[PDB]
């Protein structure tokens, strides 16, 4: 149609083409214009002319007030970080140095810089630079501690709710508890002095910290406490933040009726306000796909991580931890979904991507690098079985052995010996030893895996049953201890149908194993007794398979706020 360009979009391209002469005068332009000049520099690809200005804190304070075009700033910021220049670490250090100089000032200048820190530290934390956002908040925190009145106590607890969030994406859990304890010190002081603070966002972080350390018993306790303080006056960003973390603790609690209403309300609440492109919406989808994968709704769990990844791949550039986290979970979901098929080439690409990103931006001994490392190892051991080349079978299976042990060490260093995540690596390493023909070694890993999970989770739980089936296949298919395997298969059968029914698609490896269990010990009557149940499993799975996609399952306005909270709280 050949429509001419607006005079604005023409004057933008004429001051950018004359940027060297006009760099001094551009910084004096209004915020809406100034960001559009800088975004034009990114569009032209002149990142050096741009990162020379974002490294200054004052300019990055001006381009942080453009809230409409923040989604363009994240892609412009992430492009700088991959370009070279450490624009995140320079901004965080340049703020801490400037923040440390106004300690001997009044409460007007200090509140000006604290608000800069809350939008800068609120941006680096949003872009994934948790190790660099914490340095901003730790400087904002020490501004609130200087003045000990009722006014600044509400900001010190506003830093500690954010410090507790940048210390979980950075997997610094052992500092998280000390942060929460310091928050209560600034909460009890404020609450006692005739001013009650909303303790809803802060307890939501503990619903993810204690979830991360596999304290699901403690996670659900703070899940209830978080939602008891949900008020309609809270920001939607805070409210959707509590819901997604509350869902993750409820799903791992293996109760799914209360879990769906929390996260489907969260996805709706993060889609009507934030829209289908804001990273927070994709953040909710990532936790929504956690619900789908644990309820055996694996078919549409891949489609919700792919949606979650595609949002983050557009807002958060190439090499970002948030993109890498989506690559990790999508690789795991594609691993689970296509486990039966045995084809892992898209899943391997996603798992390899999540390591090519995290190893670039995180140290070699980071906990989040360990969880993303186990997913490649799970994929590698299946390729090391499906491939028919013995040389490839041995070497690829050995590579997956170094990844689990490296992943186990990082989990064992921070989560301790007695945790589900540490035991989750024992079970994965147990399955690997089964494929490595080390059936003697595979016995003691699963025994240590079940004993840790049984002691912590309980005698009957979904995670315990899924670990037993790993041991049951060991005692049945390649160790010939059918008497020992007889109770193990039955143990997982009861738990498997306890929370999913007979149509649980994971029972295929449980029912078929029972058929091979009875094939070598006689009693062929029970072979047909389990043979029709496998057909019953076939009938009860494909009939319920036909269901609409979860993206439209939430639809438009399914329920209302302050109603899902009350419905969940009373139950």
């Amino acid at each position: 149609e050949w429509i001419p360009e607006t005079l604005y979009n023409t004057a933008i391209s004429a001051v950018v083409d004359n940027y060297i002469r006009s760099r001094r005068d551009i910084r004096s332009l209004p915020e809406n214009i100034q960001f559009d000049v800088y975004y034009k520099l990114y569009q032209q690809g002149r990142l050096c002319q741009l990162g020379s200005e974002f490294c200054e804190l004052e300019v990055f304070a001006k381009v942080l007030r453009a809230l409409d075009k923040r989604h363009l700033l994240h892609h412009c910021f992430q492009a700088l970080m991959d370009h070279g220049v450490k624009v995140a670490s320079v901004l965080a250090y340049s703020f801490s140095r400037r923040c440390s100089y106004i300690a001997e000032s009044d409460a007007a200048v200090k509140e000006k810089a604290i608000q800069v820190g809350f939008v800068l530290g609120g941006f680096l934390s949003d872009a994934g630079w948790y190790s660099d956002a914490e340095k901003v908040f730790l400087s904002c925190l020490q501004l609130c501690t200087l003045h000990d009145e009722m006014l600044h106590w509400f900001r010190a607890v506003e830093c500690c709710v954010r410090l507790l969030h940048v210390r979980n994406g950075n997997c610094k859990y052992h500092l998280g508890e000390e942060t929460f304890k310091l928050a209560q010190t600034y909460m009890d002081k404020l609450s006692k002095h005739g001013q009650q603070a909303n303790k809803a966002a802060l307890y939501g972080e503990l619903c993810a910290l204690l979830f991360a350390k596999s304290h699901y018993d403690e996670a659900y306790k703070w899940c209830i406490e978080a939602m008891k303080e949900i008020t309609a006056g809270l920001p939607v960003k805070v409210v959707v933040d509590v819901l997604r973390q509350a869902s993750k603790a409820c799903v791992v609690k293996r109760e799914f009726k209360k879990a769906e209403q929390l996260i489907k309300h969260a996805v709706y609440l993060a889609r009507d306000h934030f829209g289908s492109k804001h990273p927070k919406y994709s953040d909710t989808l990532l936790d929504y796909g956690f619900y789908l994968l644990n309820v055996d709704n694996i078919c549409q769990s891949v489609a919700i991580y792919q949606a979650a990844l595609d949002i983050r791949q557009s807002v958060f550039g190439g090499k970002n931890i948030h993109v890498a986290t989506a690559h990790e979970d999508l690789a795991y979901s594609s691993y689970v979904h296509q486990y039966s098929s045995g084809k892992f080439d898209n899943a391997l690409f996603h798992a390899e991507r999540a390591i090519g990103i995290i190893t670039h931006i995180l140290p070699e001994d980071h906990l989040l690098l360990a969880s993303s490392k186990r997913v490649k190892a799970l994929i590698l051991e299946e390729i090391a079985i499906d491939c028919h080349n013995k040389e490839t079978e041995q070497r690829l299976l050995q590579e997956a052995h170094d990844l689990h042990l490296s992943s186990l060490q990082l989990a064992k260093k921070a989560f301790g010996e007695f945790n589900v995540q540490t035991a989750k690596h024992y079970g994965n390493l147990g399955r690997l030893y089964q494929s490595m023909r080390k059936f003697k070694e595979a016995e003691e890993m699963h025994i240590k895996a079940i004993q840790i999970k049984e002691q912590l989770l309980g005698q009957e739980d979904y995670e315990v049953a899924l670990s037993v089936g790993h041991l049951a296949s060991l005692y049945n298919y390649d160790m010939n201890q059918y008497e020992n395997a007889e109770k193990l298969y039955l143990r997982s059968i009861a738990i498997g149908k306890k929370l999913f029914g007979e149509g649980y698609s994971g029972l295929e490896y449980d029912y078929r194993g029972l058929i091979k269990l009875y094939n070598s010990i006689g009693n062929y009557e029970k072979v047909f007794e389990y043979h029709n149940v496998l057909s019953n499993w076939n009938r009860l799975r494909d009939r319920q398979y036909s269901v609409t996609d979860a993206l439209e399952d939430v639809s438009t306005s399914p329920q209302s706020t302050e109603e899902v909270v009350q419905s969940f709280l009373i139950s």
Binding site: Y335, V336, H470, S473, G506
Partner: peptide, 7 residues
């Protein structure tokens, strides 16, 4: 395939 989905 006999060990179900890896945890």
């Amino acid at each position: 395939q006999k060990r179900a989905s890896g945890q």
